[model samples]
Target: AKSDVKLLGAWPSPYVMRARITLNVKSVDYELLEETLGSKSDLLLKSNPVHKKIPVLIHNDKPICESLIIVHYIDEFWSSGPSILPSDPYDRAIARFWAAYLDEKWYPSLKGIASAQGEEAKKAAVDQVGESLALIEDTYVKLSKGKPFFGGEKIGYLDIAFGCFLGWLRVTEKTSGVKFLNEAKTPHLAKWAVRFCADPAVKDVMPETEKLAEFAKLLAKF
Candidate 1:
């Protein structure tokens, strides 16, 4: 018998897409329950009472909250397919380190880029964001030795972490009129990005770029 897989998340959220891509990559069928901001369901509140956030993954009546943790859980639960975390403990630790880097450093930098008001602040923010990207590009290029994905040819936790941000990355650059992913600066990163988006499993899970951009614009207002 098949297990019950449910996802409670918002349509426009990249965090939600993280879990969506993981499920798809593992070929797990699931029901997506879209949630609106400011109003959450009883299930969502009860399942994740602390943060009460989106991208909650419920499997076999057990709820897993937090995007990365949910993805890790899915990877562990179904281990037959492409791996998310590395097999070696050292490599696994590195992948997780970068994932955390993406979460704690890269994400906040881009947010600062978007939320900054003054021209000087925006420029500084863009530079900061670029620096963050630079670190990832340099580190991953060495780690992967020019592999298409962070974990070689296959998408891994590192890839999923970065992949979720592509939609918003495009929107952020477009809306801010600041360009970052250039061949000269981030050759490998730019290449992996194209490959990541073009991959059959990934493309199918991603929402429309147009809609994602619109949502990014919406977030910019607040």
Candidate 2:
């Protein structure tokens, strides 16, 4: 039976984009309610009282907070569609590991770069971001092994996890006046970013690059 599905998210949040990407890939029909950051809606506050975060998934009035949690919930609940996680236990674990790695490791470095105010602070953050980007570049190059995606030609949890950041990162680059993607060095990841954004599933759900750039400007305070 179909349940009433709605997603509470902010337009500028990459975390929200993560949920959107997962739903788009699985072809899950969901109503999206845009939330204003800092002054969140009553619905968002009530739904996610503990964390009070965006990207909460509401199914038949039951709320699931946290973006990745919502994604996994969707993955398990909607099994009739395409496989979001790998069938094999080992593959599934590896995918989860990479996804966790991105959340725990890469996002901080990117955030540091975006939020740094001083030149010296920004430079240090740039180095951190570069190191993390290099690590992820190698990760993709090894995992891809001449394939189009980390999931071997089709996107999986890891791909969706990281792919959600491409646009926001690009907008951050524009706002910070820095080049972090480094197409020349991280060619594979760079190409992957292009392909991932070009995907119909992503393009359909993603906000315009111009909109992201303006938001990034606001987030970066620049």
Candidate 1 similarity to native, TM-score? 0.94
| Tens-digit lDDT track of model 2 for 79-151 | 8877778778988888889888888988887878756889999999888878888888888888778988887
TM-score of each: 0.94, 0.91
* Candidate 2 local Cα displacement, residue 201, angstroms: 1.3
Worst 10 residues of 2 by lDDT: 213-222
Q: Would you list the C-alpha lDDT of every candidate in the order shown? A: 0.85, 0.82
Residue 48 of model 1, lDDT score: 94
**Predictions: Cα RMSD each:** 1.7, 2.1
Off by over 4 Å in 1: 1-3, 219-222
Stretches of candidate 2 off by over 4 Å are: 1-3, 219-222
Question: Model 1 over residues 25-58: C-alpha lDDT tens digits?
Answer: 8988899888865588999988899999989999
Q: Can you list the residue pairs that collide in candidate 2?
A: none
Q: Give the Cα RMSD of candidate 1.
A: 1.7
